[PDB]
Amino acid sequence: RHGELQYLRQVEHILRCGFKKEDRTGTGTLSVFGMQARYSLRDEFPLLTTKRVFWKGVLEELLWFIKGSTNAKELSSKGVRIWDANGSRDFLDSLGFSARQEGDLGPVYGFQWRHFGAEYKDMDSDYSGQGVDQLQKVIDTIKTNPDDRRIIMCAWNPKDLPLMALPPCHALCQFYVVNGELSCQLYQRSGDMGLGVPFNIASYALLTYMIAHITGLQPGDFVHTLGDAHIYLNHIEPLKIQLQREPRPFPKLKILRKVETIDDFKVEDFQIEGYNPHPTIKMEMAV
Amino acid sequence: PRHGELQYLRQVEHILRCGFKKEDRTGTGTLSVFGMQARYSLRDEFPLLTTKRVFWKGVLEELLWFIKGSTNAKELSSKGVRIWDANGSRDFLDSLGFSARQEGDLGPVYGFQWRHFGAEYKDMDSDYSGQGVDQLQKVIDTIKTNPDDRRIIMCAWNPKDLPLMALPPCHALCQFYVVNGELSCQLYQRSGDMGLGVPFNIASYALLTYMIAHITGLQPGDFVHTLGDAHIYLNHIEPLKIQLQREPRPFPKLKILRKVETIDDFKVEDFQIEGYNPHPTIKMEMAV
Ligand SMILES: O=c1ccn([C@H]2C[C@H](O)[C@@H](COP(=O)(O)O)O2)c(=O)[nH]1
Numbered sequence: 001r002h003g004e005l006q007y008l009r010q011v012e013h014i015l016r017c018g019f020k021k022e023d024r025t026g027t028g029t030l031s032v033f034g035m036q037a038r039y040s041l042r043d044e045f046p047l048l049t050t051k052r053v054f055w056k057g058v059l060e061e062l063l064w065f066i067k068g069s070t071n072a073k074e075l076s077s078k079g080v081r082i083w084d085a086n087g088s089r090d091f092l093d094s095l096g097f098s099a100r101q102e103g104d105l106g107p108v109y110g111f112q113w114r115h116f117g118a119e120y121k122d123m124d125s126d127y128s129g130q131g132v133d134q135l136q137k138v139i140d141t142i143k144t145n146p147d148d149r150r151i152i153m154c155a156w157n158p159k160d161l162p163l164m165a166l167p168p169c170h171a172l173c174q175f176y177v178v179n180g181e182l183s184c185q186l187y188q189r190s191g192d193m194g195l196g197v198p199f200n201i202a203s204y205a206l207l208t209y210m211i212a213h214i215t216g217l218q219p220g221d222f223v224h225t226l227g228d229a230h231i232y233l234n235h236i237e238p239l240k241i242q243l244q245r246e247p248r249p250f251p252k253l254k255i256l257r258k259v260e261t262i263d264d265f266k267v268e269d270f271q272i273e274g275y276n277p278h279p280t281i282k283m284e285m286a287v
Numbered sequence: 288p289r290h291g292e293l294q295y296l297r298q299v300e301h302i303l304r305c306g307f308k309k310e311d312r313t314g315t316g317t318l319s320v321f322g323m324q325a326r327y328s329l330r331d332e333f334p335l336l337t338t339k340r341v342f343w344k345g346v347l348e349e350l351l352w353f354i355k356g357s358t359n360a361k362e363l364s365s366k367g368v369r370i371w372d373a374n375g376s377r378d379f380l381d382s383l384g385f386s387a388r389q390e391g392d393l394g395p396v397y398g399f400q401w402r403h404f405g406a407e408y409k410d411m412d413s414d415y416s417g418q419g420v421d422q423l424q425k426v427i428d429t430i431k432t433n434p435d436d437r438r439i440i441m442c443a444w445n446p447k448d449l450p451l452m453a454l455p456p457c458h459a460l461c462q463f464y465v466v467n468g469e470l471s472c473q474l475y476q477r478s479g480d481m482g483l484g485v486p487f488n489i490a491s492y493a494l495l496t497y498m499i500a501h502i503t504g505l506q507p508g509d510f511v512h513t514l515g516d517a518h519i520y521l522n523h524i525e526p527l528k529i530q531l532q533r534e535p536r537p538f539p540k541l542k543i544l545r546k547v548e549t550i551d552d553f554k555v556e557d558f559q560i561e562g563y564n565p566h567p568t569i570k571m572e573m574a575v
């Protein structure tokens with residue numbers, strides 16, 4: 001069976017078994033607590049096909065995390081605006097960060113992945129080698145002790161949370177090796193099934209590919225674990241239409257040269273091949 | 288309805304049937320699956336395994352010891368619970384490069400992370416009053432004030448403190464959730480020894496869920512157990528196979544015997560397990 005069926009099955013489960021739950025945004029959701037799906041990474045890449053995923057956003061965001069950037073502008077300049085509202089003058093001021101430059105998200109993913117526990121100053125500070133470089137640690141451990149059961153990168157940092165523009169959804173991930181295959185499990189505390197989760201599966205599948213490449217291993221599985229898995233009330237009808245679509249076989253991800261360290265990957269090193277997502281169809285709602 | 292213990296028993300079977308041989312830190316070797324998830328209802332029952340006795344006394348005294356912030360193995364040892372004693376021993380501490388540490392001093396393990404995340408650890412006797420993040424009370428305050436919140440997390444995985452810990456935490460984080468007046472908890476356990484650890488760990492986090500449900504005026508919902516490396520040690524295969532032949536009987540009940548207002552105020556005598564009479568733990572003899 002096609003891996004995307006697992007996603008569709010989760011969407012169906014929430015539509016059928018989920019409870020209505022109010023949320024932070026005021027939008028409302030149908031929600032289930034606790035879900036898990038497994039996406040093979042073997043000779044295919046799980047970029048969902050029943051609705052186009054913003055792959056450009058996935059890849060530039062991840063390269064921004066890796067370089068340790070906490071500057072929304074450094075992502076925005078690549079045409080990816082996902083962090084912009086959280087770095088805006090008015091949003092930063094709303095949190096009491098009037099001293100910050102526009103774009104300064106505080107100690108979010110890039111900073112935690114590369115400098116966990118360092119004292120955050122501003123997004124322009126030199127953190128060269130302060131704090132824990134979890135990303136490099138994970139990579140070193142996979143190479144030296146691939147049986148290790150502690151190969152973890154954690155972005156959830158309770159001491160730092162109040163300085164972040166928003167709290168991390170991807171609380172931690174763990175890697176694992178057996179049979180020359182590298183697998184990753186993501187603990188995602190909160191998943192927008194219609195709009196966030198497909199991008200999220202692609203982000204951590206890519207990270208797996210990148211690390212497998214550096215460490216000389218084959219991608220195995222990406223296990224996706226959710227806390228509050230929810231469908232926003234506004235996405236219920238679109239996802240009903242989507243659930244009726246037959247997934248197309250997943251694309252392949254190609255890495256276009258031999259890359260030796262995680263810091264050396266660049267956007268042009270990657271190719272998604274054979275990505276055939278369903279075209280959108282117009283749907284009307286009326287009262 | 289299908290008994291909740293069947294979730295655990297099915298995981299053990301799945302590992303035995305579909306797990307890969309995987310070498311490990313101890314040198315024993317394991318059968319291993321990466322990524323599993325079970326759900327244990329906590330509604331009118333308490334998931335203490337009936338097919339093999341679980342060390343309940345240990346579960347309860349250990350949790351109370353976490354809640355009070357203790358990182359001293361001796362404080363738990365005096366309760367007759369020796370589970371952390373070897374990791375606080377002179378010899379073990381010295382092996383880790385902690386020759387100056389007092390016997391019993393585990394470093395900034397769960398107790399410390401749950402009550403004081405981010406404080407600078409000195410030793411087990413230091414006053415950390417008002418230092419770091421008290422994530423345990425913050426969880427409880429959030430459940431009370433904004434139960435819909437999607438960030439109710441307590442995290443013991445602290446990369447900065449890891450090198451000071453006697454051992455790295457297996458229960459990396461947990462998350463709480465509220466719906467329909469019911470409190471649920473999900474545990475992300477990075478490594479589970481299905482034979483020896485997991486039964487105990489299910490009970491600890493189901494117990495934590497009952498305590499917090501009690502303080503917050505909610506009914507226990509589900510405990511969702513998520514595993515990273517779910518493994519059976521090669522020396523536990525034959526015992527587990529015996530255990531798998533055992534029919535599950537009804538899980539017991541947990542009663543809390545008084546009205547407790549804050550988490551720090553729970554005491555051992557506040558708890559009663561009713562209707563627990565498990566099969567004995569499994570011992571096998573072989574002439575080799
Ligand atoms: O990578 C991401 C980031 C956010 N969200 C969704 C989950 C929630 O719908 C919302 C975050 O709001 P809270 O969980 O913080 O309330 O964004 C995702 O699905 N994936």
Ligand SMILES: O=c1ccn([C@H]2C[C@H](O)[C@@H](COP(=O)(O)O)O2)c(=O)[nH]1
Pocket residue numbers: 149150312455457458478479480481483484485488
């Ligand atoms: O609460 C606990 C603590 C430990 N373990 C098991 C998992 C591993 O078998 C071993 C820990 O070793 P590492 O995962 O750290 O190698 O103990 C548990 O199951 N539960």
